[PDB]
Amino acid sequence: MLKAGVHFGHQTRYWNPKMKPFIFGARNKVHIINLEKTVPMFNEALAELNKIASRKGKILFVGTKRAASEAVKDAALSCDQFFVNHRWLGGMLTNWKTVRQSIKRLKDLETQSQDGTFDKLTKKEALMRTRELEKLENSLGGIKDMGGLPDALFVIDADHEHIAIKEANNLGIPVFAIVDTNSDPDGVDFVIPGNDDAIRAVTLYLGAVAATVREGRS
Amino acid sequence: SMQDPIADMLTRIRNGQAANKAAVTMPSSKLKVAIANVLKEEGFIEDFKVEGDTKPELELTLKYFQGKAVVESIQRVSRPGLRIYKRKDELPKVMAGLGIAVVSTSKGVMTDRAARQAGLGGEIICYVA
Amino acid sequence: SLSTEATAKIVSEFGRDANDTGSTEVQVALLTAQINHLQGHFAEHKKDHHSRRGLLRMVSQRRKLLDYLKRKDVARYTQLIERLGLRR
RNA sequence: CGUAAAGCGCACGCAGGCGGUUUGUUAAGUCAGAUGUGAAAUCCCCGGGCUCAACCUGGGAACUGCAUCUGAUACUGGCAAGCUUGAGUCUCGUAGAGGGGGGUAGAAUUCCAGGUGUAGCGGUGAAAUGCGUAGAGAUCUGGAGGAAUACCGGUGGCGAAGGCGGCCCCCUGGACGAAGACUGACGCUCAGGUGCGAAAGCGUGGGGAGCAAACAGGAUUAGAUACCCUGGUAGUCCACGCCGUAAACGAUGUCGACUUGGAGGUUGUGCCCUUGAGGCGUGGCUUCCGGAGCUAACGCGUUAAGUCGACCGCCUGGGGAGUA
Ligand SMILES: [Mg+2]
Ligand SMILES: [Mg+2]
Ligand SMILES: [Mg+2]
Ligand SMILES: [Mg+2]
Ligand SMILES: [Mg+2]
Ligand SMILES: [Mg+2]
């Protein structure tokens, strides 16, 4: 049943009353979540998740923190999936129409990286323009092309991603997310209990989500 | 003070409901019951339960349909400070007809749809919708 | 506020038995006891305004209790006030 | 009715209002039906008559009311008898600037007396008034007297509010906790009424170190009836008795029930190799923060300003006036 070796629960006081129904914790000043109620949330979780990924999966593995940013630009990145692993430039959904050209500048630049003008102008402009591009790259990588409009959203840390989730709620975007004990649920349609800032529960479910979009209908 | 229990019922409900509380209990009485009855029989609660003998204990199971609570509003109407009585022709109808009004009559605590059909009237205990 | 010995003595002089402690008659009498006792505390002092509050509280408590009995068992009421010696 | 008009400064309580829970009975309230009555006109509905209309008129409908009779008994009221959770009583303890009375301690100030000592001290922004050669201030010793209690001391504690801080005894009120035992709705609220109620202020007598309205002097200033300085009277202290007001404020009336959380403070109490200076519970009170919800907003938020009920107080534009 369980598969999460050691992600058990996490998070001490800072607990959010509304997160009681998924808590059976009480170990030494910290809640263990209800392991035996998380997994029934892989059912439904990766299900309507995939049930759309075969209807064609457009995702957004949104998750940040210099401590799991790269571990999101991974097979999470790779497949029928887009992502964000840095500061969630607020309004990036709700203002996509403004931001849509923050894209044009990314391409119209790297498309011109080993192309167009580049080694020319000055060797001032040089890395003094790749800073323009470096900056852009993170926070606006995963976006690159958005072919099929952001369709579901999968977020690591509910509240730490106040803004991201909110926008979704506003634009009618499913939002699948895992919520630590402390975080506020209900922003999340498809809720996933358990730890949300430890090198495992990430990768695990993260990697496991990559595994269900990346395969639905061949 | 205890002085008006029936409002306290109406309220312990109203409140627990707003607290998405599963169940709710309180001191019981002939009267509390008859209303818990109409409340179930009209499908505003799942089911009641009186568990005691010397110190009886009404217990109501609440309902929730969509995400909401089922009872969207429950108010007193008569009360110790100010009793209300209506004749048959002058009985009230809540939400145009949807939802109901509990009225006590010489033939027991029944709804307004009810007492109306029964051709009589009495004290209009509370409104519910 | 009155002794255990004294309070006991009166339960045993007014109720069915020691234990019948909350009997109307008893309460009244161990109230009536403390009030009278007190009359002398407030005889001297007199400016002990605060403590005075407590004493009135005793009188009005007793007053309500006396009122209760009378309504209940008038027979018991009369015996009481005689034997306790008040309601001139 | 927190901050806009609006919670009485606080309490106790008569009348009054309201009142847990059970069974029986009553049938006043309540409800049903029946009958009579509710003048005509008017209003309204459908018509009819004046060339139309206003106007006139037929007939209904309506008069939501009142009474009599007979019924129904859930709710309310009455009568009866209970019930135990509401409310009391009892037992042992706990904390406390809760009240009243008496006793007492050290530190300082002022004063009196004396040693030493000698020309200044004191005060301000700067000054001067003032104090010192009759020896001041400074220092030391002894003594008198009044007033208040450093440190502890703490969004600490107690009280209804006012408000209550050295230490000790005596008298005394309330609160809380742990067991069970007793009463059995004895309750809540409360116009009127009664009590209490800071400071100032009044009356007779005391008492008087420091402080200080008034008043005097010295300055500042254009003026300076002030702010500053040198003095200093009532007063500030005690007893007895008046006064009855304060931004008497949480500017939030009292009681009860209900509704996510988090970190403290304080105070009881149960359990745990007491084997840790603790470990886990379970009451009373308290501070901060914060959710729903509420709010004009600020904010409040299980100590509500949320959700409900009982009773009381009070508001109805500013000024006039809390005046006549
Ligand atoms: Mg005002
Ligand atoms: Mg007040
Ligand atoms: Mg009842
Ligand atoms: Mg007529
Ligand atoms: Mg005609
Ligand atoms: Mg009855």
Ligand SMILES: [Mg+2]
């Ligand atoms: Mg001295």
Ligand SMILES: [Mg+2]
């Ligand atoms: Mg001396």
Ligand SMILES: [Mg+2]
């Ligand atoms: Mg005591």
Ligand SMILES: [Mg+2]
């Ligand atoms: Mg007085």
Ligand SMILES: [Mg+2]
């Ligand atoms: Mg005075």
Ligand SMILES: [Mg+2]
């Ligand atoms: Mg005087």
Ligand SMILES: [Mg+2]
């Ligand atoms: Mg002066």
Ligand SMILES: [Mg+2]
């Ligand atoms: Mg006033």
Ligand SMILES: [Mg+2]
């Ligand atoms: Mg707050």
Ligand SMILES: [Mg+2]
């Ligand atoms: Mg709390």
Ligand SMILES: [Mg+2]
């Ligand atoms: Mg309230």
Ligand SMILES: [Mg+2]
């Ligand atoms: Mg006047």
